Structure 1
Amino acid sequence: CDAFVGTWKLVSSENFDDYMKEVGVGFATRKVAGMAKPNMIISVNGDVITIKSESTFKNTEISFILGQEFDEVTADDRKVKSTITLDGGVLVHVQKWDGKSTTIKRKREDDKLVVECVMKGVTSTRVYERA
């Protein structure tokens, strides 16, 4: 996961409002969350990977071991069960709650970190560059 390690800044966001709609995020949270230009800080210490997001909307931090389910309270306040695995270089993060599931994929592409958020038929692409 060393290629992911670093401080990253959001530079573009496509279809994020529609992704959040599909997830079930309410109007006011969608509007405020949609404006944010977060920094994502990724670090590794042994088997533990930490992903921190710092933004004007709200700060989050998750630490996890690959393949091992954990509790996550998301920025939009869902209480989800999360599992993150590595699939041929891509971090695959599945969140489950209320009989629903969404998948967030994080991958390195050129000098960018590309985040693909999928909820049923709706995909949002968020691109980060090194801070």
Structure 2
Amino acid sequence: PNFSGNWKIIRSENFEELLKVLGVNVMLRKIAVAAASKPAVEIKQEGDTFYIKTSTTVRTTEINFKVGEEFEEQTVDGRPCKSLVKWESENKMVCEQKLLKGEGPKTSWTLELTNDGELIETMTADDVVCTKVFVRE
């Protein structure tokens, strides 16, 4: 169960629709799903410590966290949040997010490995879920 690698996206389901129900305007949705916005995800895992860099043709962001320790990131629609990841199993982590300011949808995400070595990401806002699948280069 090692999440490290250079992960390339191979499936995406319900992402634009999730943004739509969050109130994201149509220009930004279409951009978010364009080929040019396809995420490449680099992960370095060392036990419970993660470094994850997500890059597209125009953006790059890095997060560093340790499982069980609170950190700060942004929600699917860009609002700052405090996050905390826990293991649900040997091969799956789950993250609960809490907005830093104001109120909003209950948001969370998960990452898990398949035995064939696919990485599955889900992101949830209230009752709406999006799933992306990646494979290693």
3-state DSSP of counterpart to 2:45:
strand
Q: Which has the larger radius of gyration?
A: 2
| Pairs within 5 Å for 1:1-131 | 3-35=2-34, 36-45=37-46, 47-73=48-74, 76-88=77-89, 89-97=91-99, 98-100=102-104, 101-109=106-114, 110-131=116-137
Aligned CA RMSD, in angstroms, stands at: 2.0
Q: For 1:1-45, what per-residue CA distance to the aligned partner results, in whole angstroms no more than 9, with x for missing partners?
A: x52111100111110012223444343332212222211011124
Higher strand share: 1
What amino acid does structure 2 have at the position aligned with 1:27? V
Q: Which runs of 5+ in 1 are unaligned?
A: none
| SS at 2:42 equivalent | strand
Shift in alpha-carbon separation, 1:47–1:114, aligned structure 2, 3 A: closer
Q: Letter of the aligned partner of 2:14 in structure 1?
A: N
In the alignment, the residues of structure 1 paired with residue 41 and residue 98 of structure 2 have an alpha-carbon distance, to the nearest angstrom, of: 22
Structure 2: any 5+ residue segments left out of the alignment? none
The 2-side partners of 1:103 and 1:75 are apart by 9
Q: TM-score, normalised by structure 2?
A: 0.82
- The number of aligned residues is 130
Q: Closer, same or farther in 2 for the Cα pair 1:77/1:121, shift >3 Å?
A: closer
Query: Does 13-22 or 70-79 show the bigger shift?
Result: 70-79
Give the SS at the match of 2:2: helix
The answer on whether the counterparts of 2:122 and 2:129 sit within 8 Å (CA) in structure 1 is: yes
* TM-score, reference length from structure 1: 0.85
Distance 1:59 1:74 in 2: 16
CA contact (8 A) 2:3 2:45 kept: no
69-78 vs 30-39, which moves further: 69-78
Q: Is the 8 A contact 1:59 1:75 kept in 2?
A: no
The answer (yes or no) to whether the contact 1:19–1:117 under 8 Å persists in 2 is no
